[PDB]
Design a protein around this nucleic acid. Sequence first.
RNA 1: ACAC
Length: 160
Amino acid sequence: SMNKLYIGNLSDHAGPADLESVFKDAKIPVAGPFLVKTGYAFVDCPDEGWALKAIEALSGKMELHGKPMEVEHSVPKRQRIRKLQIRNIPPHLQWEVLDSLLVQYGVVESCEQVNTDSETAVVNVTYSSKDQARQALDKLNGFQLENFTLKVAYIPDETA
RNA sequence: ACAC
């Protein structure tokens, strides 16, 4: 599943207790313990929705020991193959418009909506190949559509 | 330096 979070840009002395306080104060449930390394940690959310909520509400915003947090879907390096998530999609944008951008970098085998409580839309994309997803990520992360900057990232590709 |  897509419930595991990566938490990056952490203080030298950030520990599980701090992260437990951050999620409590942001009222984001977590499904298990926090595993703190050096500058980054991992934690599981009960479902994909809460994981996405944690990303939207904490990433780049939440400061901790003066350092702001990065929160992303945790994706093992080996599983960065064909699948992306695109966030901050203009709310009522027709899928023909989004798709016309996606096809410019490869064959899109699947394109699915992630229903979110923000105004913007979120979709999960599967391209034919690793090379195509990499290109689509390079050219679509940061692309300005209407007035929204698209946010593109890997999600686990567990079938390759 | 997304865990080794």
